[PDB]
Amino acid sequence: DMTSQQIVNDMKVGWNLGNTLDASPDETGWGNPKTTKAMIDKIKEAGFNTVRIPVSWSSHIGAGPSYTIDQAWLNRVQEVVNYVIQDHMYAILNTHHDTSWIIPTYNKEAASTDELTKVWGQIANRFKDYDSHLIFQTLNEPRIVGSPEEWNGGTAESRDVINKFNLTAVNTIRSTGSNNSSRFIMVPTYAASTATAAMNDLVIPNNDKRVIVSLHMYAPYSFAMDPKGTSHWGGEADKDALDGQLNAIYNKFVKNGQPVVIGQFGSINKNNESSRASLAKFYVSDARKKGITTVWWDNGKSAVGDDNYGILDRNNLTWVFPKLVRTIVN
Template identity: 50%
Template structure:
């Protein structure tokens, strides 16, 4: 570059007002439609571009598009993320998910095998590094990422007896996670708990007891408070908060409380409806008018509850298990995803990597086993 006085003056006049936003050429990212700024892949290195956008939670959820769960990988009930048959997560996997058109990656994480004892419950640095590395694979693809506490029900027991200890541990764990991601922009979403419930009780999947629902509300409260207390972008980051067991049971819905009535809390629910088709797999057929009416009623129940409260909703898990019924699964997925979008709900397909169950993507070959289902979900959000 020539270094004359004239050129210096011209450049100074044209560029001085933009000086604070200048970035190294090799670290800049393309902008997504709508002039929404993306930040560097490693967002810990730069805080200036990590502003939280001034959009409502409902606008935010619509922008999340179609979602896909990286299930049964970082959330195994083991120290080994391959314990449930899935390979180590690679950038190539997440690249393929994004290439198909999915805009949100839900990243379930089990923490209990990677933290120390009380009172600090220190999380292993290597485990946090792995979580962040996978998240950055998605951020490289301009995706949203949901990081949560997943299969940790062994210590998150919703009873008054256990509550003081559980709350103390939740505060320590969420403080560490939130601090690690504090400078990330709002494409990073926290989800306080996955399906908080009292395991192996009669009410486990039926909305729980009054005590259980109250304890879960308390657990969400301290988790949200811990995240907000870390400051930075976490003061107004979008946080997903689930009902008891993430259930749409009437008791779970009626006793659900938004912590602090926080305007940036998004409701998280799961619905494998109808159960016999989606989860149990004992009824492999779906698509009659009666089937559609039943599923519509399920969605209306969710919408009627939270629309009047002005709350945005994410369907964090849904899907159908394989029963040698590709046509029925496709019909269900098309109807389900469309019903979500019509009500402003982000649909996030549960993929556990098992091709005999919920998987529609082969993580070993990087091929879509059921591309029609993936396309139906993505196209619904378009």
């Protein structure tokens, strides 16, 4: 009987198993160890209630027109889903670095739609009997790689085609029955962008009451993502800018009865844990006041500088940034 907003609130706060099943050609390909139950237990013990499990399917899909997903890969994905589910957390299962075959142009739409139907049909069938703690996310950051608008919310054409892709995925999921008839489903804007036009052009498939919007927002960019940007965050201007961004999401979606999960946020290590914790504390608390649940991007990289978003050392089961983790889960 739960509503989408009740689900989002129950999810509380999440952690991404990044650079893992989303790596290629296999789980260890980008330097992370094979995931264990003990790693996921650490997540639960810290107080997270959601794990997002990004999965890149491309390397595991056979030739058209069957597009068969390798059974051993599905079996491994299910092992990882089970770590999370057996710990009584929400699991988000997606498609991830799949832009090679998911291409949002009118010219590529028919072929991508067909493959999405075949691929989501197999994923959904395998996972159909899980309860509502398993959430499907149709697409990660669907976009045209290399286009000028890739990180600016796309174009009218690509935003239109993404709506068709999300609709195809939702219909395919629901068509498989069992608990997929009522499973909660996350769908992104173009690139999961918070750009005004990306959010304005999103159409919820079938106006389905069990669809949640997925957005990614590593704000503020210069502090959080840019290795050349400032290493300090705090104070009234920084709070005002972030509150403004969260309020735009609240005003567009949440206030109108459309729930939102920020399925990726985070900051890189600039030897600046205090600033990173100040940011996370404000981000998570202000998002929650606006009904929005957040999910930290952890790629297993905790050295200093570019792309080091990891906060758990998976190899020795140690939280590297203990003040930061505590601000995320409080």
